[PDB]
Amino acid sequence: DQSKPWNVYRLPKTLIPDSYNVTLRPYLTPNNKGLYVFTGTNIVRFTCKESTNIVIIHSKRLNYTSHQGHMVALSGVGGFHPQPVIVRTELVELTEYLVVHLQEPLVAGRQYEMNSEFQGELADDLAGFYRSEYMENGVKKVLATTHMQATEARKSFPCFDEPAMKATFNITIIHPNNLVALSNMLPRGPSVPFGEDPTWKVTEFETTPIMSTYLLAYIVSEFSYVETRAPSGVLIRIWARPSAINQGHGDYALKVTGPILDFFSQHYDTPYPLNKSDQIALPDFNAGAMENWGLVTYRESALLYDRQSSSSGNQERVVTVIAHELAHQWFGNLVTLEWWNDLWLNEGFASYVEYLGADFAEPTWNLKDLMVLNDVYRVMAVDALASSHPLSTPASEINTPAQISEVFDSISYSKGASVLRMLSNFLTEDLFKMGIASYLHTYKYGNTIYLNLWEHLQQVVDKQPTIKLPDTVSAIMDRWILQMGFPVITVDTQTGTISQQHFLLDPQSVVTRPSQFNYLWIVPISSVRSGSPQAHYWLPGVEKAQNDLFKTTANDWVLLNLNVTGYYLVNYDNENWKKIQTQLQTDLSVIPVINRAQVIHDAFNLASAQKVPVTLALNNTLFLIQETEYMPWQAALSSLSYFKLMFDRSEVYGPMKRYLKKQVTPLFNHFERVTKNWTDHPQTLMDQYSEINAVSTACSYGVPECEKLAATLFAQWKKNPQNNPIHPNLRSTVYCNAIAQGGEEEWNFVWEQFLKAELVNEADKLRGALACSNQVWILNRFLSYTLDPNLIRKQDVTSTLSSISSNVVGQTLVWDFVQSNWKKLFQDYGTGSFSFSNLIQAVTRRFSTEFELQQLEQFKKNNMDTGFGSATRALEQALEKTKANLKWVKENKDVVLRWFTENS
Amino acid sequence: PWNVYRLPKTLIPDSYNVTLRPYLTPNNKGLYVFTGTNIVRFTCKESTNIVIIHSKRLNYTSHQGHMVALSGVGGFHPQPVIVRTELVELTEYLVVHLQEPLVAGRQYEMNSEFQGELADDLAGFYRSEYMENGVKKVLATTHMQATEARKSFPCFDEPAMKATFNITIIHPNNLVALSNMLPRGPSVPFGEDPTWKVTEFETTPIMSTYLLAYIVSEFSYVETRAPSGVLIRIWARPSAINQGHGDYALKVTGPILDFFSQHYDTPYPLNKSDQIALPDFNAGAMENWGLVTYRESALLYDRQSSSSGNQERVVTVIAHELAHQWFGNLVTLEWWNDLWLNEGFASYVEYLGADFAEPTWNLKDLMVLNDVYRVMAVDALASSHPLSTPASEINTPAQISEVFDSISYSKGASVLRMLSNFLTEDLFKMGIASYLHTYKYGNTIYLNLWEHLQQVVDKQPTIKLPDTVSAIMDRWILQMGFPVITVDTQTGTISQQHFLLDPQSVVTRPSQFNYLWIVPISSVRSGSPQAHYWLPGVEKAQNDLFKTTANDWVLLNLNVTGYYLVNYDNENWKKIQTQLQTDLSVIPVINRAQVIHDAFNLASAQKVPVTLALNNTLFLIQETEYMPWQAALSSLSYFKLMFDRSEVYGPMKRYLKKQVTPLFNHFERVTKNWTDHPQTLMDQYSEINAVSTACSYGVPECEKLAATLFAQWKKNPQNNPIHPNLRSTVYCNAIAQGGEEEWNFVWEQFLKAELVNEADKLRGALACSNQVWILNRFLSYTLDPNLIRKQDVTSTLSSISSNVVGQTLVWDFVQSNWKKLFQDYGTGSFSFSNLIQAVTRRFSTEFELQQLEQFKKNNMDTGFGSATRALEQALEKTKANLKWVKENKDVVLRWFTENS
Numbered sequence A: 001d002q003s004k005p006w007n008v009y010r011l012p013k014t015l016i017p018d019s020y021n022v023t024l025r026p027y028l029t030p031n032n033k034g035l036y037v038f039t040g041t042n043i044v045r046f047t048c049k050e051s052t053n054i055v056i057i058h059s060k061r062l063n064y065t066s067h068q069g070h071m072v073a074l075s076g077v078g079g080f081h082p083q084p085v086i087v088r089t090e091l092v093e094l095t096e097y098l099v100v101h102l103q104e105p106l107v108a109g110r111q112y113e114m115n116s117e118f119q120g121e122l123a124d125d126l127a128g129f130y131r132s133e134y135m136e137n138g139v140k141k142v143l144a145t146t147h148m149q150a151t152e153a154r155k156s157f158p159c160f161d162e163p164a165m166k167a168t169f170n171i172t173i174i175h176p177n178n179l180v181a182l183s184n185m186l187p188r189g190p191s192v193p194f195g196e197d198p199t200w201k202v203t204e205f206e207t208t209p210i211m212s213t214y215l216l217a218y219i220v221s222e223f224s225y226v227e228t229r230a231p232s233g234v235l236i237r238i239w240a241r242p243s244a245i246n247q248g249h250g251d252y253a254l255k256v257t258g259p260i261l262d263f264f265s266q267h268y269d270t271p272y273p274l275n276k277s278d279q280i281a282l283p284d285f286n287a288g289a290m291e292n293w294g295l296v297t298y299r300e301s302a303l304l305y306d307r308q309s310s311s312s313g314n315q316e317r318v319v320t321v322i323a324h325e326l327a328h329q330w331f332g333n334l335v336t337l338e339w340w341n342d343l344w345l346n347e348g349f350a351s352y353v354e355y356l357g358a359d360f361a362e363p364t365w366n367l368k369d370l371m372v373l374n375d376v377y378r379v380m381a382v383d384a385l386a387s388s389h390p391l392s393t394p395a396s397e398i399n400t401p402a403q404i405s406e407v408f409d410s411i412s413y414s415k416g417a418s419v420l421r422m423l424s425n426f427l428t429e430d431l432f433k434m435g436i437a438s439y440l441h442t443y444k445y446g447n448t449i450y451l452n453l454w455e456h457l458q459q460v461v462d463k464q465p466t467i468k469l470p471d472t473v474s475a476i477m478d479r480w481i482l483q484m485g486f487p488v489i490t491v492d493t494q495t496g497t498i499s500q501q502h503f504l505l506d507p508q509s510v511v512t513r514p515s516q517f518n519y520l521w522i523v524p525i526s527s528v529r530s531g532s533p534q535a536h537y538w539l540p541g542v543e544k545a546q547n548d549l550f551k552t553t554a555n556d557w558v559l560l561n562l563n564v565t566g567y568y569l570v571n572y573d574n575e576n577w578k579k580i581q582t583q584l585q586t587d588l589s590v591i592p593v594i595n596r597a598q599v600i601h602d603a604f605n606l607a608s609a610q611k612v613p614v615t616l617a618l619n620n621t622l623f624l625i626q627e628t629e630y631m632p633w634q635a636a637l638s639s640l641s642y643f644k645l646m647f648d649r650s651e652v653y654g655p656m657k658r659y660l661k662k663q664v665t666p667l668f669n670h671f672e673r674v675t676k677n678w679t680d681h682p683q684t685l686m687d688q689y690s691e692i693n694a695v696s697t698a699c700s701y702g703v704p705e706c707e708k709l710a711a712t713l714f715a716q717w718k719k720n721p722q723n724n725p726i727h728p729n730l731r732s733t734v735y736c737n738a739i740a741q742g743g744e745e746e747w748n749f750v751w752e753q754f755l756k757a758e759l760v761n762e763a764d765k766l767r768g769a770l771a772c773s774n775q776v777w778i779l780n781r782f783l784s785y786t787l788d789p790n791l792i793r794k795q796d797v798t799s800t801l802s803s804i805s806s807n808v809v810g811q812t813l814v815w816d817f818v819q820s821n822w823k824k825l826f827q828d829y830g831t832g833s834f835s836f837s838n839l840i841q842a843v844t845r846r847f848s849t850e851f852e853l854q855q856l857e858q859f860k861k862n863n864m865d866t867g868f869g870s871a872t873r874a875l876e877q878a879l880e881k882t883k884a885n886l887k888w889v890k891e892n893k894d895v896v897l898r899w900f901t902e903n904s
Numbered sequence B: 001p002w003n004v005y006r007l008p009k010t011l012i013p014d015s016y017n018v019t020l021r022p023y024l025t026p027n028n029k030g031l032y033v034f035t036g037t038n039i040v041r042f043t044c045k046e047s048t049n050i051v052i053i054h055s056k057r058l059n060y061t062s063h064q065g066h067m068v069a070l071s072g073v074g075g076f077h078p079q080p081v082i083v084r085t086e087l088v089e090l091t092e093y094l095v096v097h098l099q100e101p102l103v104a105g106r107q108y109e110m111n112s113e114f115q116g117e118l119a120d121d122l123a124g125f126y127r128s129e130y131m132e133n134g135v136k137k138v139l140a141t142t143h144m145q146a147t148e149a150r151k152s153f154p155c156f157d158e159p160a161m162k163a164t165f166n167i168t169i170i171h172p173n174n175l176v177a178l179s180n181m182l183p184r185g186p187s188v189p190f191g192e193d194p195t196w197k198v199t200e201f202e203t204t205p206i207m208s209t210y211l212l213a214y215i216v217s218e219f220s221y222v223e224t225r226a227p228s229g230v231l232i233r234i235w236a237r238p239s240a241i242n243q244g245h246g247d248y249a250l251k252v253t254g255p256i257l258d259f260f261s262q263h264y265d266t267p268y269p270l271n272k273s274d275q276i277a278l279p280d281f282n283a284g285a286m287e288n289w290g291l292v293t294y295r296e297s298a299l300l301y302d303r304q305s306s307s308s309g310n311q312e313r314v315v316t317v318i319a320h321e322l323a324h325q326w327f328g329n330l331v332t333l334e335w336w337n338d339l340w341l342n343e344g345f346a347s348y349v350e351y352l353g354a355d356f357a358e359p360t361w362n363l364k365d366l367m368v369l370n371d372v373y374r375v376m377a378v379d380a381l382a383s384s385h386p387l388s389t390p391a392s393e394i395n396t397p398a399q400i401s402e403v404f405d406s407i408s409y410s411k412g413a414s415v416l417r418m419l420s421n422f423l424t425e426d427l428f429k430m431g432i433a434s435y436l437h438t439y440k441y442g443n444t445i446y447l448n449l450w451e452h453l454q455q456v457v458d459k460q461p462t463i464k465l466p467d468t469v470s471a472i473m474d475r476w477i478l479q480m481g482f483p484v485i486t487v488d489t490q491t492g493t494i495s496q497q498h499f500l501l502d503p504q505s506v507v508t509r510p511s512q513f514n515y516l517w518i519v520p521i522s523s524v525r526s527g528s529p530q531a532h533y534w535l536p537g538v539e540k541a542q543n544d545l546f547k548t549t550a551n552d553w554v555l556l557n558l559n560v561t562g563y564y565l566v567n568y569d570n571e572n573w574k575k576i577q578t579q580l581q582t583d584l585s586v587i588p589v590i591n592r593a594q595v596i597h598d599a600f601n602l603a604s605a606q607k608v609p610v611t612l613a614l615n616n617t618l619f620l621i622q623e624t625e626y627m628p629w630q631a632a633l634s635s636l637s638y639f640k641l642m643f644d645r646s647e648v649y650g651p652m653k654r655y656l657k658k659q660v661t662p663l664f665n666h667f668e669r670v671t672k673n674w675t676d677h678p679q680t681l682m683d684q685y686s687e688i689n690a691v692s693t694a695c696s697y698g699v700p701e702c703e704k705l706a707a708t709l710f711a712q713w714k715k716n717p718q719n720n721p722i723h724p725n726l727r728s729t730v731y732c733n734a735i736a737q738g739g740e741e742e743w744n745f746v747w748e749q750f751l752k753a754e755l756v757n758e759a760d761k762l763r764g765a766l767a768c769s770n771q772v773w774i775l776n777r778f779l780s781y782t783l784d785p786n787l788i789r790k791q792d793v794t795s796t797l798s799s800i801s802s803n804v805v806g807q808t809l810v811w812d813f814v815q816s817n818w819k820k821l822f823q824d825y826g827t828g829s830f831s832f833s834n835l836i837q838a839v840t841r842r843f844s845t846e847f848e849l850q851q852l853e854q855f856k857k858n859n860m861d862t863g864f865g866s867a868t869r870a871l872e873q874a875l876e877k878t879k880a881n882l883k884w885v886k887e888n889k890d891v892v893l894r895w896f897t898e899n900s
Helices: A242-246 A251-267 A312-327 A344-361 A367-383 A401-406 A410-427 A429-443 A452-462 A473-481 A574-590 A593-608 A614-619 A622-626 A630-647 A653-674 A685-700 A704-719 A728-741 A744-756 A760-772 A776-785 A794-806 A810-820 A822-829 A835-844 A850-862 A869-902 B238-242 B247-263 B308-324 B340-357 B363-379 B397-402 B406-422 B425-439 B446-457 B469-477 B570-586 B589-604 B610-615 B618-622 B626-643 B649-670 B681-696 B700-715 B724-737 B740-751 B756-768 B772-781 B790-802 B806-816 B818-825 B831-840 B846-858 B865-898
Strands: A015-026 A037-048 A054-058 A072-076 A086-092 A097-102 A111-121 A128-136 A139-147 A168-176 A180-183 A192-194 A197-204 A218-221 A224-229 A235-240 A276-282 A295-299 A335-337 A446-448 A487-492 A497-502 A523-525 A527-529 A537-539 A544-546 A558-560 A569-572 B011-022 B033-044 B050-054 B069-073 B082-088 B093-098 B107-117 B124-132 B135-143 B164-172 B176-179 B196-200 B214-217 B220-225 B231-236 B272-278 B291-295 B331-333 B442-444 B483-488 B493-498 B519-521 B523-525 B533-535 B540-542 B554-556 B565-568
Touching: A015 A128, A072 A086, A072 A097, A139 A295, A168 A180, A168 A218, A218 A295, A224 A242, A224 A251, A235 A242, A235 A251, A251 A276, A251 A312, A251 A344, A276 A312, A295 A312, A312 A344, A312 A685, A312 A728, A335 A344, A335 A429, A344 A367, A344 A410, A367 A410, A367 A593, A367 A630, A401 A869, A410 A429, A410 A452, A410 A473, A410 A523, A429 A446, A429 A452, A452 A473, A487 A523, A487 A558, A558 A569, A569 A574, A569 A593, A574 A593, A574 A614, A574 A622, A593 A614, A593 A630, A593 A869, A614 A869, A622 A630, A622 A653, A630 A653, A630 A685, A630 A869, A653 A685, A653 A704, A653 A869, A653 B772, A685 A704, A685 A728, A704 A728, A728 A744, A728 A760, A744 A760, A760 A776, A760 A794, A776 A794, A776 A810, A776 B649, A794 A810, A794 A822, A794 A835, A810 A822, A810 A835, A810 B846, A822 A835, A822 A869, A835 A869, A850 A869, A850 B806, B011 B124, B050 B107, B135 B291, B164 B176, B164 B214, B214 B291, B220 B238, B220 B247, B231 B238, B231 B247, B247 B272, B247 B308, B247 B340, B272 B308, B291 B308, B308 B340, B308 B681, B308 B724, B331 B340, B331 B425, B340 B363, B340 B406, B363 B406, B363 B589, B363 B626, B397 B865, B406 B425, B406 B469, B406 B519, B425 B442, B425 B446, B442 B446, B446 B469, B483 B519, B483 B554, B554 B565, B565 B570, B565 B589, B570 B589, B570 B610, B570 B618, B589 B610, B589 B626, B610 B865, B618 B626, B618 B649, B626 B649, B626 B681, B626 B865, B649 B681, B649 B700, B649 B865, B681 B700, B681 B724, B700 B724, B700 B740, B724 B740, B724 B756, B740 B756, B756 B772, B756 B790, B772 B790, B772 B806, B790 B806, B790 B818, B790 B831, B806 B818, B806 B831, B806 B846, B818 B831, B818 B865, B831 B865, B846 B865
Parallel strands: A015 A168, A235 A276, A276 A295, A335 A446, A487 A569, B011 B164, B231 B272, B272 B291, B331 B442, B483 B565
Antiparallel strands: A015 A037, A037 A111, A054 A097, A072 A111, A086 A097, A128 A139, A139 A218, A168 A197, A180 A218, A192 A197, A224 A235, A487 A497, A497 A544, A523 A537, A527 A558, B011 B033, B033 B107, B050 B093, B069 B107, B082 B093, B124 B135, B135 B214, B164 B196, B176 B214, B220 B231, B483 B493, B493 B540, B519 B533, B523 B554
């Protein structure tokens, strides 16, 4: 009954919390029933802003101890009549409410305190207050940890669990005397014994700042740490398993965390306000990392680093994730989204700002350039769908916890970053950061919506003469924030005519989301004419214009969007494309490296949408035979992976592989020479990445010299496994190829190494390579292990299922397994973020036939009893993509076959 | 009446004149067609104002306002008056509506002028094609069985409506026409066009429509005369005849025909028996009286390139078709529900004929593996059917087509083998001879047979039965299934019960005998024979023949002559197991196959623990005979289907590898490094299973043999160094361990392969690829009749499906291409039901059962045609498989692991 306030998914605006006291006691040994439990009490102090006879507060999977026949007690602060009288308390499970029914309405303007006493499960579900486990020598260790985002604080204590209901939190932790408690703040004093039980201690923490419930954290463990003070005086500690800390696996995080934090404080003119910032690595963690204010939590694989055994890509991951989480200390913690429909205000800012902090940390890596591959091109695939969504989705469309979990997606993260990058570029970053500092000073300890940003940027633009815009910030940026998608910008170099239209992967798909701007953008457009920079141009919100900047003669070409600073694709007339192709084949260095990736990426996007012939995208890969840079090869491999997914079960695959083998063999041989036969690996991060791509691609497509290298390294490893001779950058390729080329013996050896792998970086590589078996029975045995948490942690299941489905033989096995174990998978991941939508996308990627479309529709019908939870949009996108795939394969299978045959 | 599938009995034909003219080039509509005329002469037995006659996909040239003409033969008072004629497509009728009833006792002639397609559909009058040098050659040929004669001319197309047939063929002057009989004279030029000739054939004997045949081709022949004087000719593509590929069939055909004439004291009545090999043919072979048609793979034989199994196939199929000249042609089933009267006899008698031609091979013993154990898997289901199925269940052409199945063929053979054993063969054949003499040129019911058998039994004193022949044989004919005979050796208690693969299959088919049989039971005690015993039609009995002491074991059903399973108390099983480990030679080789086969069936159906069945395979490490290894590999193929996608498969492979490696080494020694293969057919077969099994389960020196032999062949393709007996394994294993290069080489060899024996081995090996993209590309080729002939599609699909990577690839393909496959095979025999069984046999999970049910109801508008029972059997088996895997996966993993 949606007329009742306790049956709708937004809290009343009538009661506003001020502060919370929460006391928690985890029990880290199971009870007589085999459960791990925690007990707690809390006090919520709120103000009645508007008269009401009910208290609606969030509560999820908590059992309450009743006091006077009621689940809570309630009183006005400091006596004052009338005192409230509870008629009854009820739990409403669907909307995750505790409802307190009062005999009289509360008094507007007064304060009340509600006391509860509760019990919950320290489950292995990675949500709320939960448990994490690890082996140390012989012993199974169990610890207690939290993850509140988005809607899980209510699972550890009753609270007004929405991000705009900020409060202060007074945390007390009751814990065994041999364990340490951590929280957002420092303890108020030394821990004293629990009077009721001296084998237990009590640790009480300083009051948090005004903050959102989803940012609370508390942890009880045996962990150790390493410690430094940042130049600013902020205390930095890196916490982890004692084995990890003693091996130095926390040292790299300790190196970069304090400097990045201080960089952000200075760069945005807003000092980090707390006295410390703990980073802690958890063995069981759903997301990867979480920005809890003062106590940032990480997957081990995102915080720990072994300078002998972790790869270069592992190290990039650590500094990027740390920079991301520290960026949240401003964008999310100090200033917070008003509601989850504006998630990009937190996640888009943090995903853009991570590159400035991580580039500060590791300037020689040139990390900023990877933003095009890692974010822009990551999200453009889904943002070309009619079933995408805008950065700022209308709020009443992101209501339920499943829909909230859903929007933690590539739009909110990576399109968020892409649009802020573009804004920063055309404003200049020095101007951008002044507007942001204004934004942050105005809204600190409060909440914002998309509009509040643009005033502060407009003022800095208006107060200086150099940088000017053809419109207001709000006119330009609203078009990027309130409507989904992005334009393709098409140039006729014979007339200079320039036009825009909403880019749709399937031109026959029906866009039903209306746009007040009719899917037109105001587009900033940089360009070069045969390498020479041109005047900057803005395309106004018009379908078509003309400018001689984009007209050429027979000896000149133009190239739009240098460095792909703007969030759009570019298409040209056929003659311009030919001139670009000739330049790439004559002297590729004339085209900047990012734009070499652009002409590959955009042509393949355009081909899949019937806007260029598929042979033009393929012709754009010919020059790779002389390219040694990482990014253009990575763009080609990512584009061609759509071809792999569409064709690796068909007659096209043979000719495909022979083409890729031909294109990559000189790159493989180039690295064999410059690394002196794989003994002296390259110096720059980019060249190391290019080397890894050369080795992975050469081995995947049958370069016998790469197959020899992998076989030889693996055979050497297996002769003495206490010494690993495989460079970590090469391990995934070597492990995968040894399993692919071998049988049960190689699989079992790798599985044994996995079971004893102490370092998660190494375990991850071993686990991934196990998906490379060509034996159905071995893949299905592997699949059975994923349902055993003694073998595969819950946090790794979805990643493992994805890797197995990437295997062409595992495609049908994982599809069948997901369908056969649906109910378990839905319970485990259906209300969480990332994993379940990742899984739906991974298992359906290949679908391209009428039969497979019908089977996906049947799958949807078979599971209407559960629905699709946090993968509901993902399933609609999978349907749209499958329909597009089916038509594209039918229209291009024969031309693609012919092209690979002729250019091989 | 025209809406019911059986003909009325009011009008009975006497004779037919049919003139057919095939056009072997397409017409202005792009079709290959034949034109024809016929005259059907029949007698009105009962007055009726309608003529209902069969007609299928024939277009008529009307005359005088009607689609046929109807004359009275000497009628003259009122000649019949046609009001209306119509075609009724569903029941495949042409219906003539008359103004007045036809007159009881008068004779009438119906005259028709028609056209039909010479389609590539392998049914009726159809076309077949082959390449010769560069030229595509097209010939016209027939296959009428069961209900396709109606697709070549209107006729009363039921087998008890026998008639004589006067065939005329108008054909191009460079081609020869053949039919059942010899021509009445030299061909004469077609007056209207002298590039065509006219060949008219002698009148056939009184016979069924489904046995008529006529062929127009450029084929060559070799010729001989049987010692009895019957002319024998073997016809095939000229290239094949010129290379000698018809010579082996020329050697054996005449002698086998004469053997049957003598053995049943009933002379073949025609002056010739042509055998002809067709490039496109659905069944394998067909017994048309005087003109027996064959797949090339069932008749042709190359001394240098065909294998030993290929040669056994030829002599056995020839013997089967010649057996039909008696069992089907001379005497014919009354209706298709009693098909076993034709093919049960043929499938049993083929062994006597083949044994006569090749007495050193010992082919009679192979009937236990090839027929008894083949059918026992299906006959252990609630969805089986009796040998004599109630006629109303066998009504439509789809139901008729489906009943050409392992029950009618292999249980029919098994039951008549039983009968021939417990009364002797010499007595059996005298009773058959009586039966044949009495009902020649007519049709029979099972009850006609028992009488003639009873007469011969009653004429001698030495063979005595516990009841009449009809009483005994009714239990094996009229109710489905077979008993498991259980022996408690501690007490001599012997009991019977209907054997059911899943104890919760719900038997809804009632039997008037309550599923009890009268069972002939042979036995030995520690190797030496006991007296014979008959278990009466009772659930339970006691006899000391089956009571033993601590130092004695018994064994029932010597050489598995009887159609039943045997189970014992655990103590007897252990003693039999000890005997196999002490001296396996004491248990006759066929019963060594029995103890493996029956235990595995018993294990699947809860009557023994699965570890008993697995323990009965332990002695194979010392066995070198073909038959017990073949029984084990056939029983274990169920374990492979159930487990080759699970953790169980690793240990199961390690166990098979252990058991077979000394047999492989044994053949590596006795063949002198694979240069001198065994002299005996049985030992050749044992060698083939050793190599195949060793390579399949990873004996590294078998893998080495195959890859080396294949590479050497590929280097020098004009010189094949692989002995034909080993090609299937070597080709498959080299494909499995190689990639596109190996696959593409085998495919081009296949496309150019002239000898179907060799094409078949190449084609089967292409299913061994472990590359999804290669298997899917292969699947796409099966839709192109320039690449895979229609006669080979379901074979290829089944082969790909057997590949564990091919399992879901074929399942998806069949569902996706349902419409064409249903059209091509859904109303014919063998192919469609084989396909359904093949693609589903792995199903063992709830999810797979749900997909099967969804498949059924996605197609219930079409139905499943001649795979309708097959689908119900697949549903029953899948449900049994789910429970069986649930109940046994852990014990089976443990046993394979512990036994290495």
